[PDB]
Amino acid sequence: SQFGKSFKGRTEVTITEYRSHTVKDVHRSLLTADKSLRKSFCFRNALNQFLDKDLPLLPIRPKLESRVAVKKSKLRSQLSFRPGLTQEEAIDLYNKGYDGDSVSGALQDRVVNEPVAYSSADNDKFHRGLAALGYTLADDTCESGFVRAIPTTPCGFICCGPGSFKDSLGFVIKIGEFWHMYDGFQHFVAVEDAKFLASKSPSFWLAKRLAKRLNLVPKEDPSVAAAECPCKKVWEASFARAPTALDPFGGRAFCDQGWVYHRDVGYATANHISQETLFQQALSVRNLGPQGSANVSGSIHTALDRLRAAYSRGTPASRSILQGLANLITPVGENFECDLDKRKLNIKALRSPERYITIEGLVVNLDDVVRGFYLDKAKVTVLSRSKWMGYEDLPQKPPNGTFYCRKRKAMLLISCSPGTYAKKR
Amino acid sequence: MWAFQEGVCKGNLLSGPTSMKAPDSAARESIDRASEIMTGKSYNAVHTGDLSKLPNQGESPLRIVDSDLYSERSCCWVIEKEGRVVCKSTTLTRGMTSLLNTTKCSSPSELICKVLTVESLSEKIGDTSVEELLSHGRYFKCALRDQERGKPKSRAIFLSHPFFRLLSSVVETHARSVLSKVSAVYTATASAEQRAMMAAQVVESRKHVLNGDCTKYNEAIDADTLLKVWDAIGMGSIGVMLAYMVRRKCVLIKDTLVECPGGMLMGMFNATATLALQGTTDRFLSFSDDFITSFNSPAELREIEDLLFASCHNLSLKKSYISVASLEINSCTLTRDGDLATGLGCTAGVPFRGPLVTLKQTAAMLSGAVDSGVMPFHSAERLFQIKQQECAYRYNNPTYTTRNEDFLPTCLGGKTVISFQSLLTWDCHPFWYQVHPDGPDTIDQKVLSVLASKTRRTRLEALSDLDPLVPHRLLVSESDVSKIRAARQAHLKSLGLEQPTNFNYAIYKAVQP
Amino acid sequence: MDSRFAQLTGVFCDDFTYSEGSRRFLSSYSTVERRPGVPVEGDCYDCLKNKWIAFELEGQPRKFPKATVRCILNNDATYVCSEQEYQQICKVQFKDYLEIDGVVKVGHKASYDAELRERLLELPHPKSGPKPRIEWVAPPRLADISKETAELKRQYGFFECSKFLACGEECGLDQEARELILNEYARDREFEFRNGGWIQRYTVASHKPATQKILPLPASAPLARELLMLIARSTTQAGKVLHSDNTSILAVPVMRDSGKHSKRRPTASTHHLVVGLSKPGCEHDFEFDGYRAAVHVMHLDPKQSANIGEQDFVSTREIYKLDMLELPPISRKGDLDRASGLETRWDVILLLECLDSTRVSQAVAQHFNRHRLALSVCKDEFRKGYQLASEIRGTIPLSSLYYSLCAVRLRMTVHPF
RNA sequence: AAAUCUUUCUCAC
RNA sequence: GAGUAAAAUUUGG
RNA sequence: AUACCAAAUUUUA
RNA sequence: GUGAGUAAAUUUGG
Ligand SMILES: Nc1ccn([C@@H]2O[C@H](COP(=O)(O)NP(=O)(O)OP(=O)(O)O)[C@@H](O)[C@H]2O)c(=O)n1
Ligand SMILES: [Mg+2]
Ligand SMILES: [Mg+2]
Ligand SMILES: [Zn+2]
Ligand SMILES: [Zn+2]
Ligand SMILES: [Zn+2]
């Protein structure tokens, strides 16, 4: 009869309210932690318990061994994109007698950012507390070369350079109104009904990757089939490999709404978007359509409006850069008009004097891009007319940073530098 | 010693201040400051900036996040027993449930729709009306918050009514959405370090940086300003009701109700107050009372000052300053080129709270320090060894341990002084896994949690182990709970299983490849 | 899936059965009728035909899979559906007009909106207030910090001894003598003895603050860790002498004197009088059996004792040392003294910060960090950030603030920035 | 008595 | 006695 | 115009 | 306001 007391006057309550009412209470001790642990020898007995029974059952964790050379750098955000259980996998676990609440807690994809001031040559991600020592999360030569923007040794195939499709490589592409997935052995087709990705065999690995990229729930649908299908020809054809790290989904674009995947490479283990590679990434997908690879701070619609407003006044090169950024930030398949030629021009976005967009923590002034700053010429702002101790002299082609210039004897801050953003080398 | 640091140092090494004082003095001081501001003698609480360019959200469907309305945090519940008013502290869960019981409503969204669709303030919505809800929702209770470094006089905090919280959640959700749509550089969800990095990028085109703070922030945010912003973004009657309750708020101090017509009572509307400034200009990177704008000439500085004045963002002349080589926001200091300023910065010391929790917390603090450039790794190793020695001095008596195994910490009778690098790269005896920052809970944490649990009525039938796809906004009766539990138990028995086996995502994934 | 249709869905499934007893239509909004572990593709599910059903209004499509059957509720009272059976079921079941309420929007204008706006208009409004005139000037100089320290010293002065701070040094007595002196001092003070412990009884309070003066700095604090550990142990062990390797203390519970029926054991809120020993040579000297020592007291509340006892002196010192400029020798009153000053007094200052439960040195440190980072500040206002005497009360916090300001002054004197 | 509205235990009437 | 809001870690469900 | 829950812990306003 | 007693913090930290 506790229901009639907690919810007096009501017969129905939400699951949220009921669960919140079934939360166990914790009473804070008035003693210090030391005295609480001493009381009744609770900690002493617990230590005996742990050493006698719990400790032997503890599995042995592997020891971290892989290191790379690192150098001190700006404070950056290291982004880790941890995926959650898929919908079908959650159903399978729940129907197998596993805890429904724990499974529900593991259903959500998490993205976390950690401050770090240390960078490696290949922009590796580091284990917690070991960035200074260079312990990387990353552990066949083609597998290694597939994740690299610039593979050391081309193998004559798409993974490691320009070329056709190897056996270990699959691809997902969009033809007409269908998504064709080809592995070399099996060819499948998928469609988006309302919020599901309906396909013959959703358990297919390429189908799982497509479901994760489209933010849809896999679904089994026998009555899905296509009319025309060049999967064989494109599989046998050769495509240019853009120099770029793998996107957070673990794939690389090779054509308009087409992406290549490697079976043994799950998810990107290196920073996909960085200050030095952002514009190259934007240029790579200039005309490949939405990618959904780079997260934008704030509203995607507002960012697209700013991109369209800047795009309305710019040269072809700046226009291509802006379109590349729009493709980088737009999720795949969602209700977004990322193409900055059919999108409507917003007057309010023109009203503002400066057009800023923040992509993966990088703040870019689109007005500056229009007048050719991040790629053609750097920006110089004088900070003082006195020499500051501990600052290097101004190089001939300076990158971003604070320098002392003897030619005018002043401290200069360099931003939007091609020596930092273009880096043709 | 903080005075003789070569780099930046906040002085966080010791713990924050403690205080057993009654909250009456601080709450009375806050209310007095708000009243003084109302007279137009000390600071400006009259908003004159233009907010006509904010997008209208009035057409959006009214949706309430139920999870935001239930918690074990404290709240004020108001009872009118015999014409008097009694304010008592309860949990937000209990307060929300009492509110929903008084006005018979399945969910908070049903209550909000009913409140918005009546045709009179006297019309009953159960055992109450909109007039009574507004009367009760303006009552606040006072409390003291201590353990904040740099505040020897702890701060006054206020528990609010469940109905006030219900309306505040809606207006704050929409204020955050408008900030994400309108802010030049969105920061309402970024961390302090992310805000610092974005600010460093933003202010790199101007010579001077104004490291700015606002004083009397919550006392100078008036109900008129709140209503102005809410009308600008289109909150309609919800905004009007919330502004009315804010104007008529009363705080229970000791045993007397004290009127506070001014202010918003210590950060009740952070996003709305931020929008009050962000909606008038795009020249500031700010959230709440912290902005990092920049300028080139004294005329631009005067423009910045006027903009701050017009938005009721009174510049703190005690703490705000101008710099050219550094920039600081949210206590994070960077050089103009984006580097973290050399020094301890915000590094905080670890007090003694247990043999293994102390070591784990020290490891986490040192991992954070070394991941940034705060200190080199060998310094962290030396500090960890010193911490192990101090823990050995503190905890190596029979009242904590009776063991002598070699692999144990010296503070538990062992002879092992582990290296920081060896611990971090899982290169230790498994007993040390609990000390790794990413490792599992330590023995002390389990013991203390067990002690907290064993401190005691009648439990509702548990509604755990639900289908992971069932939305939590669906309704259940007592019979529904019983039937769902019975069906789940029958399905489990069909699988020959006891209580569902605990599901660890990491372990389960490790079985996949 | 929209809650608006929930009730409507329930009417559709009205005691309809199949397979001789089993319910035919299962509502997606019903927690009991839902099939666990099955994704939802419509408002309800027909088990006999294995088909999802959704209810839609005219020109209002809903986001459901195309395989889900749509029951369109036409503007004119009629229910169209591709399946005839569902058409008939809707026709019969929706016999009573079930009008679906419209979506309530956030900008909804209630009937009482104008009334509440008028009420708000009649209530008080703020007045404009004056625009401040801001002058940006260089940060404070050494003379300003010196003026602040001199003001504190003039207004409060100095005690004759270091009082409990002196307990950071050995009193030069053995454990037996220390225990004897502490117990005999407690006896001479007329403390109640009960159950082998000491209790300090009180009846009336003057309800005024104790006298505040600055403490002179002892030469060193070799016993800082021991003293802090003793204070930590005293949190629950009160009324009997506690011994460390080199010193001892006595924590006495302070409880009211009702006279016959009085508190006999401390509770969570009971305060402590901490009695410690230092070398003699002040007005607090106490002698017994030829043993002499200065006895110094400190009145603490439980939170203060817990906070003080938990601090780690050694680790804090090492962390500060990591990136510290050379510390100069200082005198008893925190003045630069090259000829006769001691560098160990800095340890003492650290100990003082550990003893201060208000940690005013943290506010001073934050303001000094701002000072060292600042190029320009507001005239006459930034200087008014070191005037923290009004925020604190008591000898310990006052001395902590004074020596924090002295540290700032010494930094500006010997390592200008 | 002190870092002073704090040092406020229980039971029955 | 400890509110509002943001980031992150572990544990539990 | 529009287009995960709690317990503990650290930091931040 | 009256009377009476003396579960919780001492057990057990050098
Ligand atoms: N624990 C906290 C800290 C801050 N806040 C909010 O942050 C504002 C500025 O906090 P502050 O301490 O800075 N005082 P404020 O009156 O601005 O004056 P000051 O700068 O000290 O001159 C407050 O008003 C609140 O809205 C809060 O709610 N809870
Ligand atoms: Mg600031
Ligand atoms: Mg402030
Ligand atoms: Zn290859
Ligand atoms: Zn195909
Ligand atoms: Zn003395």
Chain B residues touching residue A128 (CB < 8 angstroms): 367, 371, 424, 437-438
Strand E positions with any atom < 7 Å from protein CB?
1-13
Question: Which DSSP category does B334 fall into?
Answer: E
- C13 marked as binding residue: no
Say if ligand 1 is within 6 A of residue B144 CB: no
- A187 marked as binding residue: yes
Of C61, C93, C125, the residue that ends a domain is C93
- B212 marked as binding residue: yes
Q: Are residues B441 and B486 in the same domain?
A: no
> What is the token pair recorded at A80?
């880790």
Say if ligand 1 is within 6 A of residue B368 CB: no
Is some CB atom of chain A closer than 8 A to the CB atom of C164? no
In a domain, B491, yes or no: yes
What angle, rounded to 10 degrees, do the helices at B236-247 and B130-137 form? 50
> Across the interface, do B317 and C378 touch by the CB < 8 Å criterion?
yes
Pairing relationship of beta strands B139-145 and B250-253 according to DSSP bridges: parallel
In a domain, C136, yes or no: no
What distance in Å separates residue C233's CA from the closest CA in chain A?
8
- Site from A11, A16, A19, A32 to mutate, C interface, most C CB atoms within 10 angstroms: A32
What distance in Å separates residue B156's CA from the closest CA in chain A?
22
Say if ligand 1 is within 6 A of residue B216 CB: yes
- B290 marked as binding residue: yes
State the resolution, in angstroms.
2.4
Alpha carbon B119 to chain centroid, angstroms: 37
> Across the interface, do A31 and C236 touch by the CB < 8 Å criterion?
yes
Cα dihedral sign for C323, C328, C329, C330?
negative
- Overall size of chain B counted in residues: 513
- How many domains does one find in chain B? 3
Say if ligand 1 is within 6 A of residue B360 CB: no
Contacts of A233 (CB under 8 A, 6+ apart): none
Q: Which ligand is nearest to the CA of B212?
A: 2
3-state SS assignment for residue C66: coil
Write the single-letter amino acid at C256: R
Pairing relationship of beta strands C78-81 and C22-23 according to DSSP bridges: unpaired
Q: Are residues C86 and C149 in the same domain?
A: no
- CB-strand contact C277/D, under 7 Å: no
Say if ligand 1 is within 6 A of residue B295 CB: no
In a domain, C316, yes or no: yes
What span, in angstroms and rounded, lies between the C-alpha atoms of C355 and B318?
28
Q: Which ligand is nearest to the CA of C162?
A: 6
Q: Are residues B56 and B201 in the same domain?
A: yes
CB pairs under 8 A between A and B: 340
Say if ligand 1 is within 6 A of residue B218 CB: yes
What span, in angstroms and rounded, lies between the C-alpha atoms of B24 and B29?
9
- CB-strand contact B465/E, under 7 Å: yes
What distance in Å separates residue C37's CA from the closest CA in chain A?
5
Is some CB atom of chain C closer than 8 A to the CB atom of B119? yes
Ligand 1: residue whose CA is nearest its atom 28: B267
Task: Report the nearest atom of ligand 1 relative to the CA of B316.
Answer: 22
- CB-strand contact B151/E, under 7 Å: no
CA B186 / ligand 6 centre spacing (Å): 59
> Across the interface, do C65 and A198 touch by the CB < 8 Å criterion?
yes
Out of C41, C67, C268, closest to residue A30 by CB? C268
Say if ligand 1 is within 6 A of residue B168 CB: no
> What is the token pair recorded at B387?
């911490």
Q: Are residues B270 and B224 in the same domain?
A: yes
In a domain, C101, yes or no: no
Chain C residues touching residue A34 (CB < 8 angstroms): 232
CB atoms within 10 A of CB C78: 11
> What is the token pair recorded at B137?
């929702």
What span, in angstroms and rounded, lies between the C-alpha atoms of B441 and B438?
9
Write the single-letter amino acid at C383: R
Is some CB atom of chain A closer than 8 A to the CB atom of C416? no
Q: What is the 3-state secondary structure (H, E, C) of chain A?
A: CHHHHHCCCCCCEEHHHHHHHCCCCCCCCCCCHHHHHHHHHHHHHHHHHHHHHHHHHCCCCCCCCCECCEECCCCEEEEEEECCCCHHHHHHHHHCCECHHHHHHCCCCEEEEEEECCEECCCECECCCCCCCCEECCCCHHHHHHCCCCCCCCCCEHHHCCEECCCCEEEEEEECCEEEEECCCCEEEEEECCCEEEECCCCCHHHHHHHHHHCCEEEECCCCCCCCCCHHHHHHCCECCCCCCCCCCCCEEEECCEEEEECCCCCCCECCCCCCCHHHHHHHCCCCCCCCCCCECCCHHHHHHHHHHHHCCCCHHHHHHHHHHHHHHCCCCCCCCCCCCCCCCCHHHHHCCCCEEEECCEEEEHHHHHCCCCCCCCEEEEEECCCCCCCCECCCCCCCEEEEECCCCEEEEEECCHHHHCCCC
φ, ψ of residue A252 to 5 degrees: the values are -130, 130
Out of A30, A32, A217, closest to residue C39 by CB? A217
Chain B residues touching residue C314 (CB < 8 angstroms): 386, 389-390
Residue lying closest to nucleotide G10, CA to C1': C237
Q: How was this structure determined?
A: cryo-EM
Task: Report the nearest atom of ligand 1 relative to the CA of B151.
Answer: 12
Q: Which nucleotide's C1' atom has the smallest distance to the CA of B365?
A: F10
Q: Are residues C232 and C315 in the same domain?
A: yes
> What is the token pair recorded at C266?
């401390």
In a domain, B457, yes or no: no
* Residue B494 burial (10 A CB sphere; 0-12, 13-18, 19+): exposed
Residue of A nearest to C61 (CA): A194
CA A172 / ligand 5 centre spacing (Å): 9
Is some CB atom of chain C closer than 8 A to the CB atom of B234? yes
> Across the interface, do C302 and A30 touch by the CB < 8 Å criterion?
yes
In a domain, C148, yes or no: yes
CB pairs under 8 A between A and C: 35
CA distances from A420 to A280, A400, C412 (A): 12, 6, 39
* Residue B141 burial (10 A CB sphere; 0-12, 13-18, 19+): buried
- How many domains does one find in chain C? 2
CA of B344 to C1' of F9 (A): 21
* First and final C-alpha spacing in chain B: 53
Out of B354, B368, B426, closest to residue A33 by CB? B354
Strand G positions with any atom < 7 Å from protein CB?
3-14
Residue of A nearest to C29 (CA): A14
Chain C residues touching residue B232 (CB < 8 angstroms): none
Chains with at least 3 CB pairs less than 8 angstroms from chain A:
B, C
- CB-strand contact B440/E, under 7 Å: yes
| Full domain range(s) for residue C183 | 142-414
> What is the token pair recorded at A155?
């193998």
- CB-strand contact C302/D, under 7 Å: no
Q: Are residues C85 and C230 in the same domain?
A: no
| Full domain range(s) for residue B403 | 355-451
CA of C270 to C1' of D11 (A): 21
Cα angle C161, C166, C167; round to 5: 145
Q: What is the 3-state secondary structure (H, E, C) of B273-333?
A: HHHHHHCCCCCCCECCCEECCEECCHHHHHHHHHHHHHCCCCECCCCCEEECCEEEECCEE
Pairing relationship of beta strands C248-256 and C271-278 according to DSSP bridges: antiparallel
Pairing relationship of beta strands C69-74 and C51-57 according to DSSP bridges: parallel
The position carrying tokens 């540290």 is C407
Q: Which nucleotide's C1' atom has the smallest distance to the CA of C208?
A: D4
Q: What is the 3-state secondary structure (H, E, C) of B54-66?
A: CCCCCCCECCCCH
Task: Report the nearest atom of ligand 1 relative to the CA of B214.
Answer: 17
Out of B102, B197, B400, closest to residue A37 by CB? B400
- A160 marked as binding residue: yes
Say if ligand 1 is within 6 A of residue B437 CB: no
Q: Are residues C66 and C156 in the same domain?
A: no
DSSP B238-277: HHHHHHHHHHT-EEEETTEEEE--SS-TTTS-HHHHHHHH
CA B286 / ligand 1 centre spacing (Å): 14
In a domain, B403, yes or no: yes
Strands (E), C164-283: 192-194, 197-202, 241-243, 248-256, 271-278
Contacts of C66 (CB under 8 A, 6+ apart): A193, A194
Q: Are residues C49 and C153 in the same domain?
A: no
